Amino acid sequence: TVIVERWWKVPLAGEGRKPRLHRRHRVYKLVEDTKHRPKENLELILTQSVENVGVRGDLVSVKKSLGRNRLLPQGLAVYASPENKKLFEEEKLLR
Amino acid sequence: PLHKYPVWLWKRLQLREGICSRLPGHYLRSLEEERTPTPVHYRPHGAKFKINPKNGQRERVEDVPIPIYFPPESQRGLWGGEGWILGQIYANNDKLSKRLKKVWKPQLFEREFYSEILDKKFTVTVTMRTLDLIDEAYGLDFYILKASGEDLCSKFGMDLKRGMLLRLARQDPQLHPEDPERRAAIYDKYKEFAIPEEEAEWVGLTLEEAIEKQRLLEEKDPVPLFKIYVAELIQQLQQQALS
Amino acid sequence: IPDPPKHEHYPTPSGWQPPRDPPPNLPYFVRRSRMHNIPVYKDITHGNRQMTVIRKVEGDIWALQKDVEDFLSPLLGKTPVTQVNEVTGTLRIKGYFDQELKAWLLEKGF
Amino acid sequence: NFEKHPKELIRGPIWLRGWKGNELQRCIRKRKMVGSRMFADDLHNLNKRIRYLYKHFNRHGKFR
Amino acid sequence: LTYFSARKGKRKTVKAVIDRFLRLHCGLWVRRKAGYKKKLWKKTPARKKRLREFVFCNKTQSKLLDKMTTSFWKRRNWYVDDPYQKYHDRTNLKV
Amino acid sequence: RLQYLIDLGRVDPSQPIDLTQLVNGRGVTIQPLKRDYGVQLVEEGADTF
RNA sequence: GCUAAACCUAGCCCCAAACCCCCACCUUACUACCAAACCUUAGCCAAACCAUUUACCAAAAUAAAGUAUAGGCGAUA
RNA sequence: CCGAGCCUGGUGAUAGCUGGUUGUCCAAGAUAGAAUCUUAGUUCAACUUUAAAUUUGCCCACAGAACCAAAUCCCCUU
RNA sequence: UUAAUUUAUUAAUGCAAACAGUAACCUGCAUUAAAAAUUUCGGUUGGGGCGACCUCGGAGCAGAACCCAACCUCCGAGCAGUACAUGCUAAGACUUCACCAGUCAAAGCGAACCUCAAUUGAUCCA
Ligand SMILES: [Mg+2]
Ligand SMILES: [Mg+2]
Ligand SMILES: [Mg+2]
Ligand SMILES: [Mg+2]
Ligand SMILES: [Mg+2]
Ligand SMILES: [Mg+2]
Ligand SMILES: [Mg+2]
Ligand SMILES: [Mg+2]
């Protein structure tokens, strides 16, 4: 996403009121673009046995593109919600 | 002369006097609520006060939002509160230079999503912000049920919301029978966002649809006065037979 | 405004001194201000023109004018020029004589 | 004993009732006190008049 | 100078004047000498001291600055430890 | 000024004198807006007080 | 002595109060009857030129205060 | 009525440029200069007006003002 | 237009961004082009143009306080030396006919015991 900042300062409005904006208030300045920062990872819990990126019942760190196109559409893994943290640790305790 | 009421208040006067008055209460509550979105294209001040530089005094800070622009394709899809930034920019990051128009657009994808409550694969025009909000919401079903009306910011997204909410509120035979335990698992997974059907039918509508739905409710093809007056006469004759 | 207390020895510290009871038998009278002060004021009308105003005079303002002239003729070495206002009951004198005139009116007992 | 004021005895318009001001200030005060209830071309004439009187009082006459 | 603002109807100060001059309460304005910290290598020591002084302004310059500010800048200020509190008033000024 | 207010009764010296009391007897005018932080005592009349 | 000249109410203005409105007619309107809305105002203008900038208009009393603040740090805001 | 139509709006555009600015009667009142994208203008000065404070103003001859004409400057007195 | 400022728009690259992999199209940021788009085109001048000048100083016009024009007559400067008290302060004055700027200076503290014909430039910024 594109994060902008205003070049000119907006005068404060009241505590209930909305500020008044002018031409100089929509002169902008890009500060960051979240499109291209280094890629993060999301935590998936893998619920089948797949190649050594993960094994059944294990919480793993997976590259975002691979986790979103393969593991979740095919149901191979599930999101690391606290609910299924508890559910799969209960399953492991049963095992 | 002068109007009795200000012109910014004319719309509320309509919403109080019309068929818009016969709209149900919760719907008009939402329409009047109309809160503020989540920061997407601007970075919020984490604090209400800040010791500004150049003099060590705390000035109050408010964070003012960028006027973002959403096209009808956005409403056909789902953009996560993300839209076009139509603004100006200075030529070389230097105010003593040309000032010149600029339109910042998002990046758009055609992704295919499964919703466990409706059991259907939708292909929609998402962006990375929706994908990330879905990941932090732990699924599309949770994202659409949890996200607010204007943070979701899609006519389609709120159609999905009231379809899902009506599905929950009626507890429908959603996939088919022979899996009622799996259906119970689904509705138990999303049992927290359960609202009455008389509310879930009005979730997410525009005002035009709400007025159309309301007048469809109150059409009521007229009662013949033959029926009305024979009812009155039968009542009067039974009263006379009693007396 | 509180009427001020009854100190033992007058004039007090800061030099206040109450109006002399009974009033002096004079053709005129000068009221204290509401703050119980002598009503003699400096005035300045250009960068130049500096005056003294005596401004709550009741009675015979021309008697007051004659007495001020008698008093201030040694101090100047001329006769001072004054503007009598019989209507508003005030006296203007050309020149700053506020401390001298205040002491003089306290001497009379006003 | 001071629980009313003759400015509250004044019957008049809301924006000049207990106030004087000059023609620009009267237009500015009328716009911000009763401007949102005005008829549309009455506002348009009032905004034109504030604009003109601004140019006039800030840029004309002697005594610059 | 904006005798009548569009916003309030009030009179405006020239902040250029407030950046450069000091108004003492008696009506005197005090400035610096134009050039007082440039080319000090090529200026002679007496000219350098003449440049280092704080000077008073002319009568018509004083009246112009009187006009170019509002009366907030002409009030009597009782700051804590002020290097000009003795200069804010005129002594023995006969005529 | 303090002695003037005390001798004319505008400040009661038998009870503590405080910013409220000086304001109420109208000896000092304080403007908090306009950045007055209070009152400073002043040696001006210290000879005869 | 011609041409004229004279007239006063038809209404209007600013406020206050109070929220207001049978037939035919989108085809060539006023014609009885056939297979799609949503996107920054710009510029004149001030800067004694003009190129960043230039009041308000896009509901907000009095004062704080034309203050903090902004600004070819200048006009101005 | 085209080297960029016409109409409405912004808009009472802007005009250092031209033109005009309406009762009576008295009074005082004239051409140093400096800067300026400035010489068709403006700002400062000088002058002019008003009101104020106060005490000296103007005109003079004697003395006095440099070495390499006509006259000016200064003022004690009138 | 081979003037200033810009590439917001288009184009063709590059870099990321979003896919397929194996031991193209859309978006964001840069660039060079195109089309443009905005804007301006000093002054004196014996009409305007051409040519020359534009700040400062010495001389003459301007003979003896001060001043005094020129597209009038002539001559020069945009620094150079010596040490680096070429410190710091402060009565009183001069002033290029305004302001800005410029100049002298007793006394005092600290010390060794400036030459100069102009010899230069404000404010904001940096
Ligand atoms: Mg407020
Ligand atoms: Mg007075
Ligand atoms: Mg202009
Ligand atoms: Mg005009
Ligand atoms: Mg001109
Ligand atoms: Mg005459
Ligand atoms: Mg010319
Ligand atoms: Mg001079």
UniProtKB/Swiss-Prot annotation, chain B:
Lineage top rank: taxon: Eukaryota
Keywords associated with the record: Mitochondrion, Ribonucleoprotein, Ribosomal protein, Transit peptide
Residue ranges crossing the lipid bilayer per the database entry: none
Gene Ontology, cellular component aspect: cytosol; mitochondrial inner membrane; mitochondrial large ribosomal subunit; mitochondrial ribosome; mitochondrion
GO term, biological process aspect, one: translation
Subcellular location(s) per record: Mitochondrion
Tissues where this protein is expressed: Found in a variety of normal tissues including spleen, testes, thymus, liver, kidney, brain, adrenal, lung and retinal tissue.
Presequence extent in this chain: 1-54
Keyword Cytoplasm among UniProt keywords: no
SUPFAM superfamilies referenced in this protein's UniProt entry, alphabetically: L28p-like
Primary site of residence: mitochondrion
Single GO molecular function: structural constituent of ribosome
A Pfam family of this chain: Ribosomal_L28
Assembly and oligomerization: Component of the mitochondrial large ribosomal subunit (mt-LSU). Mature mammalian 55S mitochondrial ribosomes consist of a small (28S) and a large (39S) subunit. The 28S small subunit contains a 12S ribosomal RNA (12S mt-rRNA) and 30 different proteins. The 39S large subunit contains a 16S rRNA (16S mt-rRNA), a copy of mitochondrial valine transfer RNA (mt-tRNA(Val)), which plays an integral structural role, and 52 different proteins. Interacts with OXA1L.
Protein family (similarity comment): Belongs to the bacterial ribosomal protein bL28 family.
Any further remark recorded for this protein: Potentially represents an important therapeutic reagent for HLA-A24 patients. This antigen is recognized by tumor-infiltrating lymphocyte (TIL) 1290 in the context of HLA-A24.
Record's protein name: Large ribosomal subunit protein bL28m
Organism: Homo sapiens (Human)
Curated annotation (Swiss-Prot), chain C:
Compartment(s) of residence: Mitochondrion
Family: Belongs to the mitochondrion-specific ribosomal protein mL49 family.
Keywords: Mitochondrion, Ribonucleoprotein, Ribosomal protein
GO molecular function, one term: structural constituent of ribosome
Annotated region (Disordered), positions in chain: 1-22
GO biological-process terms attached to the record: mitochondrial translation
Protein name: Large ribosomal subunit protein mL49
Tissue: Ubiquitous.
Superkingdom of the organism of origin: Eukaryota
Subunit architecture: Component of the mitochondrial large ribosomal subunit (mt-LSU). Mature mammalian 55S mitochondrial ribosomes consist of a small (28S) and a large (39S) subunit. The 28S small subunit contains a 12S ribosomal RNA (12S mt-rRNA) and 30 different proteins. The 39S large subunit contains a 16S rRNA (16S mt-rRNA), a copy of mitochondrial valine transfer RNA (mt-tRNA(Val)), which plays an integral structural role, and 52 different proteins. Interacts with OXA1L.
GO cellular component, one term: mitochondrial inner membrane
Swiss-Prot record, chain D:
Chief localisation class: mitochondrion
Keyword Lipid biosynthesis included in the entry's annotation: no
Protein name: Large ribosomal subunit protein mL51
BP terms from Gene Ontology: mitochondrial translation; translation
Family per similarity comment: Belongs to the mitochondrion-specific ribosomal protein mL51 family.
Keywords: Mitochondrion, Ribonucleoprotein, Ribosomal protein, Transit peptide
Subcellular location as annotated: Mitochondrion
Keyword Ribosomal protein attributed: yes
GO molecular function: structural constituent of ribosome
One annotated Gene Ontology cellular component of this protein: mitochondrial ribosome
Subunit structure: Component of the mitochondrial large ribosomal subunit (mt-LSU). Mature mammalian 55S mitochondrial ribosomes consist of a small (28S) and a large (39S) subunit. The 28S small subunit contains a 12S ribosomal RNA (12S mt-rRNA) and 30 different proteins. The 39S large subunit contains a 16S rRNA (16S mt-rRNA), a copy of mitochondrial valine transfer RNA (mt-tRNA(Val)), which plays an integral structural role, and 52 different proteins. Interacts with OXA1L.
Curated annotation (Swiss-Prot), chain E:
Domain of life of the source: Eukaryota
Major localization class: mitochondrion
Subcellular localization, as worded in the UniProt entry: Mitochondrion
GO molecular function: structural constituent of ribosome
A GO BP entry: translation
Gene Ontology terms: cellular component: mitochondrial inner membrane; mitochondrial large ribosomal subunit; mitochondrial ribosome; mitochondrion
Alphabetical keyword list: Mitochondrion, Ribonucleoprotein, Ribosomal protein, Transit peptide
Family of this protein: Belongs to the bacterial ribosomal protein bL35 family.
Subunit description: Component of the mitochondrial large ribosomal subunit (mt-LSU). Mature mammalian 55S mitochondrial ribosomes consist of a small (28S) and a large (39S) subunit. The 28S small subunit contains a 12S ribosomal RNA (12S mt-rRNA) and 30 different proteins. The 39S large subunit contains a 16S rRNA (16S mt-rRNA), a copy of mitochondrial valine transfer RNA (mt-tRNA(Val)), which plays an integral structural role, and 52 different proteins.
Protein name (database record): Large ribosomal subunit protein bL35m
Portion held of the full protein: 94 to 188 of 188
